Symmetry: C3
Subunit: 228 residues, 3 copies
């Protein structure tokens, strides 16, 4: 329920907090118009996650969901966090490659669908339906990753080499991390219940910090953010 | 309640699904910057409606509301769908006529008001208050339609003839379809109860498919989306 | 609960309504691209507040929250109103000073955090935690005000004198009004309970009208909105 995994919630909260502070301070030594944006976007991600992880720790971002004839504790704040941060991660990749607005809306819309349906499946009472949503959500994610490889990478190459290369790595990071989420939900308590809520929370905290601080450390330590 | 109108919910879900797939495939043969946007926007509308109609079918996008001394089943997901799609429909008309940002915000804000207040009235427990919201919502809609005729049409004429003409028809379609919604809510169970929830659901499914697939078919089969 | 402060709710609703109508009519005599935006943005703020104050009056935007071993009535619609209007107020200041997009996102993100966490603390059941949220929210507000003085004012001076001066006053107004909110929440029933819900509602209605109509009257009666 809400006791065993508090340590992961607390570690997550601390890591997001420290991460947000490191980016704030680091962003002071910046005045380049375009550099700001990457900093503004990359510092906001963990600021939000910080409040979301804190809300789960204190017990506000949690709710019980009845299914499989049981009362399962669902951390809805985990999805609320994802609803606002993933589209911002997509934006960094978008600015990085100079993506057209038409492409930006497509990704954001698919991203909102991905999270929105994942949340619906998290809260769904009927067992089998739960996986229908996990399937729709998963498709949106592949759609997103399909664009990042067949509508982004091809363009980054048409840009400065430092940008194409940084983007290439950030894209690669994204494929690995994002794809890891649906797998965790499927083996966890929200889905198949092959692993307890305790290890499910830990796994997502590891993934969230990696994507919300780790990914930030890579992008923000790159010259790909300045126009030279 | 949630049994009689399932056929309309299922037909709606299927029609939105097939519609989304047709636009995805059709959008592959497109690379024009501005063409993308119309495709990105027009394909996302039914993608979302699809998930919303599926959520109503499975019973997740439904809730019971007490009023008139009765327990009335309210499909809140129907409004959730509208909250995200109507502003996107407005965007197609906006891009189509090259509308200024000031005008775009006005329409979107009024649109969010229109749906937001319609939802409040859908969920309202006190009978008479329900119609106060229907009235505020309806005013926002006329405001929107007033701009599409006295702040849009006049400009489309100052653009390419194919655009002005396509916009003219799309505007005309919008007046007829949008205005049809408040009328349906008033005679339906959510409002006057002059017609059962069964026919209310059917009527809105017909309208939603028309606006989410039909309207798309018209816009996307037009040269008004390319810059020549 | 929901009876004593209805007069403030009704006065608030009326003032926001009349305010919205005054701006609509006033905005008709405007065609300047940039003038529209200030009008579009400044007229939408009270349009929304109007619906929010009306929802509190009728009793829809209210909910009871258990804490301190008591059932406290929380006007969640007050925060819902703030969630959409404050970012729009920030936009007026942003357009006014020609702020970069990177700076705009930072402010909006911090603003959404400020309100989001204030709402969490409003709804929080555990007494001490409530103030943790008030503290996080308050920090975001100072962050916002810190940017309006060390990332905005310095630029407005690099613009036309009428803009710099109007912005200077609008900034000054913002510092005074915004800072007044957290103080009210702390002494009110949602926080310390040093003053009844009756006076808490009155105080916020006074502040809301000032920021949603008052501030509008100042900005819209200024030439700082036209490009000359
Ligand atoms: C906070 C940062 C990131 C990158 C979060 C990413 C989350 C996902 C990619 C989540 C995906 C899901 C899928 C595809 C289907 C099951 C439900 C999830 C919401 C966990
Ligand atoms: C999904 C596509 C469209 C075009 C949906 C449009 C919906 C409306 C115009 C709804 C309007 C309403 C009004 C004006 C007042 C009563 C409540 C409604 C939300 C049904
Ligand atoms: C409607 C217009 C305005 C300017 C509203 C402003 C509201 C605030 C600045 C609210 C701030 C809060 C803080 C900083 C912390 C306690 C909770 C509040 C949400 C009241």
């Amino acid at each position: 329920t809400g006791r065993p995994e508090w340590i992961w919630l607390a570690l997550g909260t601390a890591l997001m907090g420290l991460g947000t502070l490191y980016f704030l301070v680091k962003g002071m030594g910046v005045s380049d118009p375009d550099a700001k944006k990457f900093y503004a976007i990359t510092t906001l991600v963990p600021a939000i996650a910080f409040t979301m992880y804190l809300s789960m720790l204190l017990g506000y971002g949690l709710t019980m969901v009845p299914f499989g004839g049981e009362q399962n504790p669902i951390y809805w704040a985990r999805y609320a966090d994802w609803l606002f941060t993933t589209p911002l991660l997509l934006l960094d990749l978008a600015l990085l490659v100079d993506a057209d607005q038409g492409t930006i809306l497509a990704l954001v819309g698919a991203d909102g669908i991905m999270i929105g349906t994942g949340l619906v499946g998290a809260l769904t009472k009927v067992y089998s339906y739960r996986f229908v949503w996990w399937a729709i959500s998963t498709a949106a994610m592949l759609y997103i990753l399909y664009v990042l490889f067949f509508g982004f990478t091809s363009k980054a190459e048409s840009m400065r080499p430092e940008v194409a290369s940084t983007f290439k790595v950030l894209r690669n990071v994204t494929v690995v991390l994002w794809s890891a989420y649906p797998v965790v939900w499927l083996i966890g308590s929200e889905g198949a219940g092959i692993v307890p809520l305790n290890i499910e929370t830990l796994l997502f905290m590891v993934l969230d910090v990696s994507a919300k601080v780790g990914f930030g450390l890579i992008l923000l330590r790159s010259r790909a953010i300045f126009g030279e």
